[PDB]
Amino acid sequence: NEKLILALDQGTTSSRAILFNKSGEIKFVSQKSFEQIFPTPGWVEHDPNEIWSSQISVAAEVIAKAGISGLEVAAIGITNQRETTVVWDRHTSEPIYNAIVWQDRRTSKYCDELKSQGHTDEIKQKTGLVLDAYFSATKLKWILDNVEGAREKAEAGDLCFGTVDTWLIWKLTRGKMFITDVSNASRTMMFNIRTMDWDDDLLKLFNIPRAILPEVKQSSEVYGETSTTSTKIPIAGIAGDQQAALFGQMCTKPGMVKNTYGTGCFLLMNTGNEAVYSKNNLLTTVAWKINGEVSYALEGSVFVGGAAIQWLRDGLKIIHDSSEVSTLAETVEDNGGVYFVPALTGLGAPYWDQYARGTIIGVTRGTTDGHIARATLEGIAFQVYDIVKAMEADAETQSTELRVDGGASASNLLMQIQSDLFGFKIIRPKTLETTALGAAYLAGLAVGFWESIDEIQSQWIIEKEFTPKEDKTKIDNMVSFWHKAVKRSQAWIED
Amino acid sequence: EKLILALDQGTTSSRAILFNKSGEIKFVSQKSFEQIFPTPGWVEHDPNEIWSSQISVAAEVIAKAGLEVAAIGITNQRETTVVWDRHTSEPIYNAIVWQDRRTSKYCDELKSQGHTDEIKQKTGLVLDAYFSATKLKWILDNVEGAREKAEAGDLCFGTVDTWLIWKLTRGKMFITDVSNASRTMMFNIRTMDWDDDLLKLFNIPRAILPEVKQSSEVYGETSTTLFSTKIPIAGIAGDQQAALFGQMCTKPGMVKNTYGTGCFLLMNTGNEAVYSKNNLLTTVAWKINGEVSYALEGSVFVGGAAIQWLRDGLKIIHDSSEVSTLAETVEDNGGVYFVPALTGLGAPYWDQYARGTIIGVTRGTTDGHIARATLEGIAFQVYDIVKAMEADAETQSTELRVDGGASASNLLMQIQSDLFGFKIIRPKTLETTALGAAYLAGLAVGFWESIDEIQSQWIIEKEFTPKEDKTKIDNMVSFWHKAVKRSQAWIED
Amino acid sequence: EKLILALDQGTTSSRAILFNKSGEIKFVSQKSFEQIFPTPGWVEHDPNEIWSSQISVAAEVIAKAGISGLEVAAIGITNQRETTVVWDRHTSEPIYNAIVWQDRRTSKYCDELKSQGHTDEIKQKTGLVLDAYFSATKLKWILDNVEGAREKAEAGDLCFGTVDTWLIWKLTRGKMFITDVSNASRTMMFNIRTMDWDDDLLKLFNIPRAILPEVKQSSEVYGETSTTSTKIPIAGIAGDQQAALFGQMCTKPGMVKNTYGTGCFLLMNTGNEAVYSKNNLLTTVAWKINGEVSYALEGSVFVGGAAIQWLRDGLKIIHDSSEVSTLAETVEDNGGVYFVPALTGLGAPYWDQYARGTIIGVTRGTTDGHIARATLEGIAFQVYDIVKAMEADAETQSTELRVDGGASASNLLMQIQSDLFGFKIIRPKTLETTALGAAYLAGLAVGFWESIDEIQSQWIIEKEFTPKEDKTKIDNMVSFWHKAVKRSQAWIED
Amino acid sequence: EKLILALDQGTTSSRAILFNKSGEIKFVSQKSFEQIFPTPGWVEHDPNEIWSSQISVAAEVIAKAGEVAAIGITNQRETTVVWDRHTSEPIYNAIVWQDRRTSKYCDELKSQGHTDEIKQKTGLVLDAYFSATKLKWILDNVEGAREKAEAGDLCFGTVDTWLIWKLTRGKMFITDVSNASRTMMFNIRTMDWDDDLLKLFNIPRAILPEVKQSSEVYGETSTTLFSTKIPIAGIAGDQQAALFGQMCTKPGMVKNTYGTGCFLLMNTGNEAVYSKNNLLTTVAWKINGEVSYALEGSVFVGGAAIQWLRDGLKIIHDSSEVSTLAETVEDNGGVYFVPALTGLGAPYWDQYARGTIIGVTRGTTDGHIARATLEGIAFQVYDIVKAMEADAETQSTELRVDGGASASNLLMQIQSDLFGFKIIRPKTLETTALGAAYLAGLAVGFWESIDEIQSQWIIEKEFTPKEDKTKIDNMVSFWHKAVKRSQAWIED
Ligand SMILES: Nc1ncnc2c1ncn2[C@@H]1O[C@H](COP(=O)(O)OP(=O)(O)O)[C@@H](O)[C@H]1O
Ligand SMILES: Nc1ncnc2c1ncn2[C@@H]1O[C@H](COP(=O)(O)OP(=O)(O)O)[C@@H](O)[C@H]1O
Ligand SMILES: [Mg+2]
Ligand SMILES: [Mg+2]
Ligand SMILES: [Mg+2]
Ligand SMILES: [Mg+2]
Structure with a gap:
């Protein structure tokens, strides 16, 4: 019979789930938009609970739409809006704040401080990135410094950081898999792209405890099976959305x-x-x-x-x-x-x-x-x-x-x-x-x-x-x- | 807080609602699906979109709430008729909706032949395009090969409750309740069983019909999904009967x-x-x-x-x-x-x-x-x-x-x-x-x-x-x- | 270039069009006016807004043409038919809205006249059928239902007109009180065989003869405009649908x-x-x-x-x-x-x-x-x-x-x-x-x-x-x- | 009761208002006309549509009133109309006050040191706002316009002059002091057209109207189909009229x-x-x-x-x-x-x-x-x-x-x-x-x-x-x- 590959594409604007066949052809697509939250102009936030509900509901929808069940799905591949930062309780899986999106500008003044303090060349060499509100580290620091009780919970090992891929894989595995790939990791400004490791000097600069970070894995590998509760489908691919487009081209x-x-x-x-x-x-x-x-x-x-x-x-x-x-x-x-x-x-x-x-x-x-x-x-x-x-x-x-x-x-x-x-x-x-x-x-x-x-x-x-x-x-x-x-x-x- | 999941598959949208013990709505998700009109007077739904719309709002409402679902109750637009291959779950035609009028002239044929009062006495129903039997007969008569497949027991008929439960259990449960079954014009409401006289009249082989159950009983559990755990299925009623009970x-x-x-x-x-x-x-x-x-x-x-x-x-x-x-x-x-x-x-x-x-x-x-x-x-x-x-x-x-x-x-x-x-x-x-x-x-x-x-x-x-x-x-x-x-x-x- | 001015007072809008000797539209102005429905089935027009809309498009089209009224060779008048205006001969104030040809209020009275055997009579004299469409029952409604109308009419203090007659009255400040044979034939008061107002019909509808305009030919120099003003000859009148037949x-x-x-x-x-x-x-x-x-x-x-x-x-x-x-x-x-x-x-x-x-x-x-x-x-x-x-x-x-x-x-x-x-x-x-x-x-x-x-x-x-x-x-x-x-x-x- | 008729020819629409002795509005009609943009930055009006829209509303309010004791004329200022004296046909669209096309030439006059002279003589600054450069553009860019202007075969007017020209079938060619002051050809100190400015802009004096008071019986409108002869008795640029109205x-x-x-x-x-x-x-x-x-x-x-x-x-x-x-x-x-x-x-x-x-x-x-x-x-x-x-x-x-x-x-x-x-x-x-x-x-x-x-x-x-x-x-x-x-x- 026919086997399909399921791609979850958690975009800035909507979450998609697409079933492909062995010929690379789209057989079925489901898509669902979610709220773009602007607490004040220049800020952009997502409800991490609506990222998840939108993404998993279109996953269920596209399989159902295909006339099939999860038994026919060969593997799950994860790709996502990058940089966007989610922080949750390691024990209850509740976000401690909204997701701060890559577009959000609130950390602009802090990024300028870091430039004036001399950090531009060090950040570029370690990460390939520029000092801009775009990337995850300053968003993570904002949450730890501003959310009531967040810094103390993070220092006790009770918090989780993730880009969207890690958040989705956390929810897909009932917290049993806390991972990211090298491409998503490289967008955080906490990941040294030369040593291919989280950078303790950058973690020190941003006052981020290493225990809050996920394990970095490669972009194509059987990491494990889904277990939200549930069907066991192998999760075997992760990539930031724009790198995945490059791979797809x-x-x-x-x-x-x-x-x-x-x-x-x-x-x-x-x-x-x-x-x-x-x-x-x-x-x-x-x-x-x-x-x-x-x-x-x-x-x-x-x-x-x-x-x-x-x-x-x-x-x-x-x-x-x-x-x-x-x-x-x-x-x-x-x-x-x-x-x-x-x-x-x-x-x-x-x-x-x-x-x-x-x-x-x-x-x-x-x-x-x-x-x-x-x-x-x-x-x-x-x-x-x-x-x-x-x-x-x-x-x-x-x-x-x-x-x-x-x-x-x-x-x-x-x-x-x-x-x-x-x-x-x-x-x-x-x-x-x-x-x-x-x-x-x-x-x-x-x-x-x-x-x-x-x-x-x-x-x-x-x-x-x-x-x-x-x-x-x-x-x-x-x-x-x-x-x-x-x-x-x-x-x-x-x- | 434990919750109960209600799936309400309506004529124009599918809903999933989580209630607490006080009867309060805690979470609700709703999604419309296409109303298909092949010619004026006909009304069809895609059975796979009935299913995809219903299962996506179930997944969404469970996700919104963040395993803690005590049971699922199933309720649905009545009479609407779905026929599918028993081995593949492939519908062999669209769902023919209760509103559809295509069988009107055949109903009038049965009226003139004197079957109106017999049908009223057996089923409580008025001979009309509204009910399931003539829709199922249309599908078996007009869909290439469907008649021979139904005669061999390779097809399934269901109202929407049966279709949903079929898909929820990956074809392990083939059931309906007494309230939905009574809307088919194939179910005798006095004997409370499928009526062999009516099945012969409409030329429907008994083998195609689900088992009729109570409206409140643990029939079994859902088959393994991505979005949830195995949940007991424990209620079924036609939507209007459910509204009467809800009132x-x-x-x-x-x-x-x-x-x-x-x-x-x-x-x-x-x-x-x-x-x-x-x-x-x-x-x-x-x-x-x-x-x-x-x-x-x-x-x-x-x-x-x-x-x-x-x-x-x-x-x-x-x-x-x-x-x-x-x-x-x-x-x-x-x-x-x-x-x-x-x-x-x-x-x-x-x-x-x-x-x-x-x-x-x-x-x-x-x-x-x-x-x-x-x-x-x-x-x-x-x-x-x-x-x-x-x-x-x-x-x-x-x-x-x-x-x-x-x-x-x-x-x-x-x-x-x-x-x-x-x-x-x-x-x-x-x-x-x-x-x-x-x-x-x-x-x-x-x-x-x-x-x-x-x-x-x-x-x-x-x-x-x-x-x-x-x-x-x-x-x-x-x-x-x-x-x-x-x-x-x-x-x- | 010499131009001819047509005024087309329609059911929906008033228009003024200037034509050249080749029959070509050179300029046109148009203005809508209110359609008044006091109850479903009734249709009325404000006769002063018929006038103000019509005179203002006449002025606008002449100005639009870069010309003055002196260049206009003549004026032709055409209009929605049957629609009934009644005004005071001395003040020119209407005593009621215009009752439009579409209006149905007189339906039951028409049926009355049918049950009294008048159907063949009406058709023989006028060519028309007993229907709320035509002028006579609307005029009778106004005289019967407007406070003081019946007394003013028998005293000769009122004027009846279809819209051609109303426009020409305003255009001449009351010096010309006329209609043509085509508009007149739509009133159900005009015998189309004798080509004259019908006294028997006037008796039937209880309409005094003194309230009716003089019926003229559809093409003849009737006189000059004189709102106050410039003298342009008014030289053509026809009901709009008959005008269209002549225009085709x-x-x-x-x-x-x-x-x-x-x-x-x-x-x-x-x-x-x-x-x-x-x-x-x-x-x-x-x-x-x-x-x-x-x-x-x-x-x-x-x-x-x-x-x-x-x-x-x-x-x-x-x-x-x-x-x-x-x-x-x-x-x-x-x-x-x-x-x-x-x-x-x-x-x-x-x-x-x-x-x-x-x-x-x-x-x-x-x-x-x-x-x-x-x-x-x-x-x-x-x-x-x-x-x-x-x-x-x-x-x-x-x-x-x-x-x-x-x-x-x-x-x-x-x-x-x-x-x-x-x-x-x-x-x-x-x-x-x-x-x-x-x-x-x-x-x-x-x-x-x-x-x-x-x-x-x-x-x-x-x-x-x-x-x-x-x-x-x-x-x-x-x-x-x-x-x-x-x-x-x-x-x-x- | 007698009424006064105000004709307000605006940039966006033409209006006619009849006021009673108490200054209350008894009748008002308004009609918009086309804003023409041949290229971004340019703004033109059809002078024939300024005229027809203004007559249409005037005829409508006069019809509802039917006793106009007099007419007051007021208008969008600066907007420049040029027409043949003998046929009344405009030789170009009206160039509206908003039009920017003469901007580079105003900057050329600034560079040549004419700012102080313009300001002392007219009270104005060198900007495409004002009439003079618009009149010069039309005389320069419309074929045969300049020949006709030197021979006295053309008329220039702001919108008040155009309206009075058409209202009198060419018998009155006038403007008031307030409108004239906006042309940048009128000296506001001597209170007369300025020959030095006319030389500067290459404008012949023979195309300008006669400048009159803002309140004065100038004459009467010509006979129309819709009205008798009415005295014309006031003219002012619209914004000065509002200053008076306040x-x-x-x-x-x-x-x-x-x-x-x-x-x-x-x-x-x-x-x-x-x-x-x-x-x-x-x-x-x-x-x-x-x-x-x-x-x-x-x-x-x-x-x-x-x-x-x-x-x-x-x-x-x-x-x-x-x-x-x-x-x-x-x-x-x-x-x-x-x-x-x-x-x-x-x-x-x-x-x-x-x-x-x-x-x-x-x-x-x-x-x-x-x-x-x-x-x-x-x-x-x-x-x-x-x-x-x-x-x-x-x-x-x-x-x-x-x-x-x-x-x-x-x-x-x-x-x-x-x-x-x-x-x-x-x-x-x-x-x-x-x-x-x-x-x-x-x-x-x-x-x-x-x-x-x-x-x-x-x-x-x-x-x-x-x-x-x-x-x-x-x-x-x-x-x-x-x-x-x-x-x-x-x-x-
Ligand atoms: N482009 C168009 N297509 C269809 N109908 C139109 C169009 N333009 C105008 N109309 C209709 O024309 C009708 C008026 O036509 P006209 O000949 O002016 O009327 P009247 O018979 O009253 O003199 C209106 O009822 C309007 O709905
Ligand atoms: N109710 C309103 N609220 C705001 N602006 C309005 C309103 N009605 C009209 N306008 C504006 O009024 C302007 C015209 O004002 P008006 O005094 O008639 O013009 P002008 O100064 O050119 O003579 C237009 O630009 C229109 O946008
Ligand atoms: Mg997106
Ligand atoms: Mg519905
Ligand atoms: Mg009309
Ligand atoms: Mg304006």
Whole structure:
């Protein structure tokens, strides 16, 4: 009979569960959104209990939807929004605070303190990361320093830290497995990517007790079975979502690159077994560990990509569904002079301005909602443009193509705009959910669903190519006004 | 704190509710699923989406609460018919919903051949497309190979309770309760067993039918899932019978009306099956501690679903709750009547060919009047089955207990009270369908020690008393009945 | 450039259109006014807002044209028919709202007159049927129900008028109190055989003769405007549907047009002969020009484009009238839904004063798309029934139909109509043939144009719709339409 | 009873209002007309639609009234119309006051040292706001225009002159002192067209109208189909008309109008006062042979930003919904909206600033956007009041307000909170039209004195401030931060 691989993809915006077959084809998908909590502008939080309820309910749903039961599932693969920090009671499994999301800006001033104290080069060398509110360590420190009774419980060994993967695996195993993988660990700013170990010097700097940390495991390995209560399904793959997308795009050789258009926008290049330090404001990170071999990546991180479309839908309410942004944008011929820097949670690479905020500029009396949707799409593509120009310099290579994926990559208009900005081709494959696909791959190799990586190479199938159709001079004048708008967005928040 | 899980698989959404021992709702999850209309008059559900929607809200509500579930009670949209391969659990056709009208002409054939009274005497039911038997026969007649498979015992028939329990136990339990079984038109409510005369009439092989059980007893436990532990399954009842039990209507003469997808008025008649003389149904309420209780029922096909049509179809409201605000933009119905026969007419009309009819429209008619007429149309339909039941019982009621999602509309309840000429009692918990399933399961595992323990949990939240002149009410009822006749005998095929 | 000014006082909006010598619309202004419903079934207009809306669009279109009133060669007047205005001869103040042709309040009295044997009499004298549609019972209602009206009327202190007469009264500050033969024929007080007010009918409705305007030809220089002001010659008057017949060049016996406006109105030119209908149509006066009277056969549908305005204003499922076509195209067919738009009862061939708007066939899958599509079909089905009645009367099978009016702009409605008939629909370049015809009447009177022959070449086909064959579907739709119509009938009782 | 007809030709719509002797509105009609944007930054009106919309509303109110003792004319200022003298056909669209196309040429004149001369002669600053560069653009860019202008075959007019031209079928070619002062071709010290400025802008004197008093029987309208000949007896630029309508006829008296833009005017008596804080010196009116002057702060986009929410962004469907939508949130949520949709007027005078929304986060709603629009209106008025207080060396304790957008109670409370003093809103918000009526009525003796009409000014509501001055100072600080982020945006 038929066997399937289950990928759980716990995203910033929704949790997904997808069933793949041996051909890498999606057979069934369930998806469920969960609340984006903003206690004050600049802060972003998730209910850790709704992360779990949304993720496990769509897991039950997709199996049921498939007409099958857990008996037909070969293995579970876990991938997740990265950096986001959960802290719970080791004995009751209750979160002691909400999850603080990677987008949250509240630790910006402390990160600036750490820069002024001289820690930038030490942090970069050990972790590949920059001193930004983006990563987990300062969020963990915030919870231990601010939640009533948290510091004393952590020093007694009664607390657990996790990125979302660890939280989900904890809940899936009734607390019997407290683990993370190297790729998720590398995003915490507590994990030395050169020694591939939690860094006691960094733990000392952040005043974090080592006992609160999970065990770091490789990205593809039978770690154990589920036991929420219950069905015994092997959990065999873990990876941060953007690394899993890289794995899902077959970018397993040095120099291969993809960009994901999801809640944010993330460009990752595989750098083999060498940690490459950026000269152009990008991150050094761990790609995965498989068969005992570590692979590294360079990364450009854009905080708000598709989330700017979600803002048009839920905040501004000028569209009813995400898919209408392209239709609305096409009611106008161009951006009409409007530029939208979507720094709704600050600016990531290459700017790293924790204090920039969302900025729409150039509005006149004839500006319409169509111009706003079109400038939203351009602002997404402008941000990816900037991290690609950073990565090309780090690589000292001019690109001729770019593989793309993620939910916002479904917009043909967005991909054409992006192609036009780049002056080279955009390549969109048949399966846009490469994040979940990569996790399925990682788990499937570990249990033997697939015999080797060569077996799954022929599954990467191009669906549509976009080629540039615009004058390089006019593109450079749009780019010029984009960079001018970005500066207008910066150094806005003072507190 | 131990809890009891109620699964309420409705016509338009699946729910999972956790109750504590005080009868309070502690956690609730709900998820809609697709209403499939292959041609006007047909109504289908995907059985795998009935299942996926029901199991995902069960997983979600358990997860929300953070092993501590004492038992599960199962309750469901009745009559809706599911047929599946016994070895694969693959449905061989969509579920054919109770509202579906495709078997109307075959029912009329059986009427003309003289099977109407035999069916009434055996099953308590009116020969109508409403019930399961003709839907199962359609599937066996029209699905390639299904007939030979059913004859060999390789297929299963179930109402939705049976389908849910099949999937919950990975095909280890193939059961229904007496209340659901009584809605199939294959179950004799006097012998309390499947009827061989009716099975031969509809050409249904007995091998395809589940075992009929009590409404409250530990049947077994759920099969191993990802989201929970093995949980006892300990209650089953058709949703409207569960609502009657949830309303504490355990004594002869007690009545409730549910305002849900449709509208359903049931009176408990004790150990006595009471045959209607006024176009109502005689049905099984439940079986508990070995004792069978019966009911008289008035069945309205489209009640809250007409509000859903204003939202999804006409799109003059964005959410169900907005129907009352919109109706309150006008002072009265403006001359407009809406017979919501969107799936034909149920009791007391039993017109399979009636269709939705809006009449009396003028140039000043607004969307406010349409909303008002929608609510009045729900209330007028309930009016007609109450008058029928008052005739059967030879009583003039002085009050009526109500529940259900659409009973949240204070305006709809005021309209209803004005039409009735007596009081309407709305309790604190409107989800009496799920509550009743919880009660049946909880009594069975001892979560509650006796029905005397749960009495105190019925709490009155608001009473509505009539306001309008009787002669004005009489005029409106007269035009309503005039509109009903304009709706009738519309479809010919 | 010399221009001709047409004033088209419609049921829904007042319009002013300036035409050149080529018959081309050069400028147009339009303004809606309030539709007043004191109780369901009643329909009233504020006569002062008819005036203020009409005089303000006249001013606006002249200013819009970069010209002044001096450049205007003449004014032609056309109007919603039957609608009844009564005002004080001395103060020009109306004594009551205008009672609109759609109004049903006089239905029971019409039935009274029927049961007293007056049906054959009314038809012989006027060509009309006993129905709340026509002016006489509305005027009688006002004299009988307005405090002091009956005394003022017998004293000669009141004026009656259809809307042409009201506008001309205001335009001349009471110096001209006139109507034309076509408007007059709609009052049920004007004998179309003698071509004069009928004293027997006046006795029956208890209407004093002194309250009636003088009936004039449809094309002749009556006098000048004089609101205070500038003298422009008023030189043409016609009821709007007869103006549309004249605007469609339907000046020879047997020529036909249907207008898709607030209602739907099918008129055939019958020349010098008043043909009496055997299929529930009206016999009416088309016009009188150069001393020559032309008659027509008419089929009258009360609610056509008004059903679209009801989707916009009442149901609010469209924002603009033109969106009805787009919404209707979101579905492939009516989905089983039928909409009998009897919002003001049923006109020809049913003449049911008590029928009311009816939507039937709704199921759980029915959408606003189907409602839009059923609305367009209901317009087309009602035109289908009067065309079939006119073919029987004429003993002729049509092979084409010239169409016009605001709702004829809908390509989907015209295709549906062509599909139902199985023959082509011809839409001309100017949809405002009501206004065009009124302009023709005034232009011929002042010599702006020399003759009918001269204007013939101005009628230019914009688009032809040819029928798409779907015989089984169409027969089934028409059958359920007739079934639906019966479900709408005999609804109101009081 | 006789009535006065005020014709208020606004930037957004044309209105006609009939007032009785008590100053109450007896009839009012309003009709919008098209805002044409050939390219972002440009703003044009169809002069034929200005005319038709104004006639339509006039004919409608005259129809309802049916006794018009006189007509007062008031209008959007600066907006420039050029037409053929013999055919009355305009040779180009009207170039509206908001239009920015002449910005680079104004900067060219600044570089060539003409700022002080322009300010001393006209009270104005070199900005695309004013008529002169718009007239020059039309004469330069429309084929054959310059030949016709030198031969005296063309007419120039602000909107008052265009309306009177059409109302009299070309028999009267006039403007008043207040409208003329806004052209940058009229010397407000000599009170006459300035030959030196005309030479500078290459404008022939033969295309200008005759400048008249603001209250005087100039003549009568021509006979129309809808009315007899009516005396035309008052003309003033709309914002000066509002100053008159607010009874601000004594030195030091101030009002602010919240209309399409926002305009703060103080009467300075018979003395032209030159600003030291980026305001304009302008002619208030001339009545009974006496010229009155004013200081003015000009905000280009006030209520027009609400119209942009309605027509552009479409998050409201009627202008009045802005307050309700803004009340769905408790504060601006960190969002600031600089409504520089046509550049920035006083005190910034940045022709190249454009509309800027800043501070957006993921939880920002359309509610916050509505609230930031109202605050942005109030912030701009805050800035011109602060500049005016510096010129006048006086701390205000109150401010009289009027205009279509002042009907928003929320907007007025925000403004009061920011100011820290009270806002006085009178019963009739149409003080522009009221002032036109007053000017016309005085001229024909409908009212026999200024003192007679004084009692017609009735306070309808007073708003008192209710917020902490430091929390306001921080909002104001961020507002000023946002303004700078909007500036020097356009390069061409
Ligand atoms: N694009 C359109 N499509 C369909 N109907 C339309 C359209 N535009 C206007 N209408 C309809 O036109 C009707 C008015 O047509 P018109 O000829 O002006 O009326 P009247 O017969 O009163 O003179 C209205 O009832 C309106 O619903
Ligand atoms: N209720 C309201 N609340 C807020 N703004 C309003 C309201 N009604 C109209 N407006 C605004 O009023 C402005 C027009 O005011 P008005 O005095 O008529 O204009 P103008 O100053 O151009 O003559 C428009 O920009 C519109 O957005
Ligand atoms: Mg997500
Ligand atoms: Mg339901
Ligand atoms: Mg009309
Ligand atoms: Mg305006």
